[PDB]
Design an enzyme around this catalytic site. Structure first.
Site, PDB file in Angstrom:
ATOM      1  N   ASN A 199       8.444  -4.904  26.926  1.00 51.09           N
ATOM      2  CA  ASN A 199       9.181  -4.803  28.187  1.00 51.09           C
ATOM      3  C   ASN A 199       9.180  -6.156  28.928  1.00 51.09           C
ATOM      4  OD1 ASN A 199       9.425  -2.015  27.669  1.00 51.09           O
ATOM      5  ND2 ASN A 199       7.750  -1.461  29.050  1.00 51.09           N
ATOM      6  N   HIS A 201       1.004   9.208  29.003  1.00 45.90           N
ATOM      7  CA  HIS A 201       1.942   8.431  28.205  1.00 45.90           C
ATOM      8  C   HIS A 201       2.088   9.012  26.795  1.00 45.90           C
ATOM      9  CE1 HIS A 201       3.153   4.919  25.722  1.00 45.90           C
ATOM     10  NE2 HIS A 201       3.917   4.649  26.759  1.00 45.90           N
ATOM     11  N   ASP A 203      -1.612   6.398  20.402  1.00 45.60           N
ATOM     12  CA  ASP A 203      -1.311   6.337  21.842  1.00 45.60           C
ATOM     13  C   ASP A 203      -2.504   6.824  22.685  1.00 45.60           C
ATOM     14  OD1 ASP A 203       0.346   6.656  24.373  1.00 45.60           O
ATOM     15  OD2 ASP A 203       2.006   6.218  23.001  1.00 45.60           O
ATOM     16  N   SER A 258       8.611   2.014  25.208  1.00 49.36           N
ATOM     17  CA  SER A 258       7.764   3.177  24.784  1.00 49.36           C
ATOM     18  C   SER A 258       8.571   4.439  24.534  1.00 49.36           C
ATOM     19  CB  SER A 258       6.766   3.576  25.862  1.00 49.36           C
ATOM     20  OG  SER A 258       5.629   2.725  25.784  1.00 49.36           O
TER      21      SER A 258
END
Ligand SMILES: [Ca+2]
Ligand code: NA
EC number: 3.4.21.62
Lengths: 281, 64
Positions: free
Chosen positions: A155, A64, A32, A221
């Protein structure tokens, strides 16, 4: 005082915690944007950066990776949130820059680092609409080497009868995770298709943010690290189970929701997954 | 409420920014190379623009 985010309860992680299992000695790579190692509600065990201009994996310039890491493994103490697997050994594998993006080669380099460093679980709350042979080979190599590999489904929402699951989630070797809310309804943004495997909470998920903060994010996520944390809980109770067995345990014990094109096998239930005998509730 | 702009594919990144900001003046626009991997959080205020090496839109812009 510590708070338990709703999604940790919803997947039945507190049942494992009450049995005494919290992910101890299980190594989880969060591939990430880095993880803020200074956050008092996280313990980062190690890591590496694959981002050429951002060489410190313990500095998260996006936010994030720190949020995803807290859903996996926020510490069990008297502050902040509680993670799904609060004793896991958490590794920051930085493959996204401050802007939340990375080149395919950086992601592959991170997966390779994870394999070479004997990670038990990889979480990839990341993706894109095309694959590559090199990416497929890296995820397939990790799984062949024994790693449980979990990724966000994407998404992209719906597009008629078309699959909208992105890569690497769309590869068969990877567990692709879609998002539901606290009522078990699919989030409207959650990707769909026959490659969708399981669902987990991904709407208004409270977790750790850099500079000792907390906040609610939405996305597949946020759903992926519930499943990666659940895999760490299962391995802490059954340390000899293979990745094949951890994946099947999660798949075979979901609470079934709607049609599989939209919900896969349904919501994970880590309590049922970590029993010897598996069935859906 | 417009949340996707398929008509912008193949246009310049400049025209795409102009058009998106007319429809969604508070949009947070980020321009990225097509074929990069990105984090999978969903942000209602954001519109990513994926461009080719010529700086033309290469993927349908959408909110998120
Ligand atoms: Ca805590
Ligand atoms: Na998959």
């Amino acid at each position: 005082a510590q708070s338990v985010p709703y999604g940790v309860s919803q997947i039945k992680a507190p049942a494992l915690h009450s049995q005494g299992y919290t992910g101890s000695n299980v190594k989880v790579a969060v591939i990430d944007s880095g993880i803020d190692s200074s956050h008092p509600d996280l313990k980062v065990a190690g890591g590496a950066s694959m981002v050429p201009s951002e060489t410190n994996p313990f500095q998260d310039n996006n936010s994030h990776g720190t949020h995803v890491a807290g859903t996996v493994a926020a510490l069990n103490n008297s502050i902040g949130v509680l993670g799904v697997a609060p004793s896991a050994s958490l590794y920051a594998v930085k493959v996204l820059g401050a802007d939340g993006s990375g080149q395919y080669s950086w992601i592959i380099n991170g997966i390779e680092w994870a394999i070479a460093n004997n990670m038990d679980v990889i979480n990839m709350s990341l993706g894109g609409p095309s694959g590559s042979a090199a990416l497929k080979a890296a995820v397939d190599k990790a799984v062949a080497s024994g790693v449980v590999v979990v990724a966000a489904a994407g998404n992209e929402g719906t597009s008629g009868s078309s699959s909208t699951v992105g890569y690497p989630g769309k590869y068969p070797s990877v567990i692709a995770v879609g998002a539901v809310d606290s009522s078990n309804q699919r989030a409207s943004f959650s990707s769909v298709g026959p490659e969708l495997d399981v669902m987990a909470p991904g709407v208004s998920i409270q977790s750790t943010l850099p500079g000792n903060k907390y906040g609610a994010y939405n996305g597949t996520s946020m759903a992926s690290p519930h499943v990666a944390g659940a895999a760490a809980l299962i391995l802490s109770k059954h340390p000899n189970w293979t990745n094949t067995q951890v994946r099947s345990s999660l798949e075979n014990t979901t609470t079934k929701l709607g049609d599989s094109f939209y919900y896969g096998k349904g919501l994970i239930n880590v309590q049922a997954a970590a029993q010897h005998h598996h069935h859906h509730h | 409420m417009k949340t996707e702009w398929p008509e912008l594919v193949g246009k310049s990144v400049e025209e795409a920014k102009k058009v998106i900001l007319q429809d969604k003046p508070a949009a947070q626009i980020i321009v990225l190379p097509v074929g990069t991997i990105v984090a999978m959080e969903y942000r209602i205020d954001r519109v990513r623009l994926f461009v080719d090496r010529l700086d033309n839109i290469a993927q349908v812009p959408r909110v998120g």
